[PDB]
Structure formats: C-alpha cells, structure tokens
Structure 1
Amino acid sequence: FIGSPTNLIMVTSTSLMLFAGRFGLAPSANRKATAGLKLEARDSGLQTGDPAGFTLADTLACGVVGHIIGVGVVLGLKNIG
C-alpha cells in the first residue's frame, strides 16, 4: 500500500491538520474559537508536556479530522479523475 497512491494524500492531510492544531490557526484543547474569527486561551486542567500546550485529546481530535478530510478528498478525486 505504502508508495506514492493514497499514502501521499492521507499522510499530507493528517500531517497538515496536526501541524495546524499544535500551533494556532485552529481550535484546540487550550484554544476556544469565538465565532470562527479568532481564538482565546484556556487551561483545560489536563496536563501535557509539549511546550505549546498540545494535549493528547487535542492530538486525537485533529488526527480524526485529518483522516475524515483525507478520506473525503481521496474518494472525490478518485471518483472524478
């Protein structure tokens, strides 16, 4: 399976969503988006170790989102061309 097929697409998709979630630019466990414009700060109480306040809950969430978005566009592109 690994080579240059679905692998490339899904890996770059989940990777960019993780890169977003870790930094700002995306709602997260320590970031509460107001109305899709900007983000506030919040200490969820769940302790992490990453210097940017990247929780395991955050990682799981953005990983699921990367997989959903990658599955979507993969099926689209392979159904139209």
Structure 2
Amino acid sequence: DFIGSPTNLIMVTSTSLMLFAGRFGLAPSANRKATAGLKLEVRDSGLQTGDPAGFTLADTLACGVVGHIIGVGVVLGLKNIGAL
C-alpha cells in the first residue's frame, strides 16, 4: 500500500527478474566455464537472440520512465492533444 503498494508490485519486480532469470542461467549446466566466445563452434556477429537477463535489466528501466514523470518535476505530458 502506498508507493509501498507500488512496492508490492515491486517485490514482484526484484523477486521476478532474479527467478525468471534463474532457470536459463542454470538450464544447460555442466558447461562449467565457458561459452560461444572461445573454442569451437562459432557463428560470428554477436547474435540477436535469447533471454535470461538481456530483458529484465531493461525492466528496472521501464518501471523508471513511467513512474518517472509522475512524481517528477510535474510530469509530462506534453500535450499535444492536451488532449485536444
């Protein structure tokens, strides 16, 4: 409740990335060390695709912009429709 309720939604945010992230990071283990970077089995680029943590650091940022103006610097707008 409060910003603290926004926080209830938010425990969900830390709890979440971390766990949703968790399986990928374990899911083919017995890798031990290492990767695509090193020995045998290139394909180049970097890539585009596949998840665990590429996508949630992004989420702390999401939460940020919307949240963002509302508290801020009383918060845009800018309208434009205003809204028309």
Identity in percent: 99
For structure 2, the 5+ residue unaligned runs are: none
Using the size of structure 2 for normalisation, the TM-score is 0.25
1:5–1:75 CA distance, 2 compared to 1 (3 A)? farther
- The CA RMSD over aligned residues, in Å, is 12.3
Bigger helix fraction? 1
Q: Deviations over 1:30-65 (max 9, x none)?
A: 967899999999999999999999999999999999
Structure 1 position 24, deviation (Å): 1.8
Q: Please identify runs of 4+ aligned residues in structure 1 that moved more than 2 A.
A: 1-5, 25-81
Count residues with an aligned counterpart: 81
Matched residue, 1:70:
71
**2-structure distance, mates of 1:79, 1:27:** 50
**2-structure distance, mates of 1:65, 1:49:** 26
1:55–1:4 CA distance, 2 compared to 1 (3 A)? closer
* Larger RCO of the pair (alpha carbons < 8 Å, separation 6+): 1
Stretch deviating more after TM superposition (28-37 or 14-23): 28-37
1:8–1:24 CA distance, 2 compared to 1 (3 A)? same
Using the size of structure 1 for normalisation, the TM-score is 0.26
Structure 1 position 8, deviation (Å): 1.3
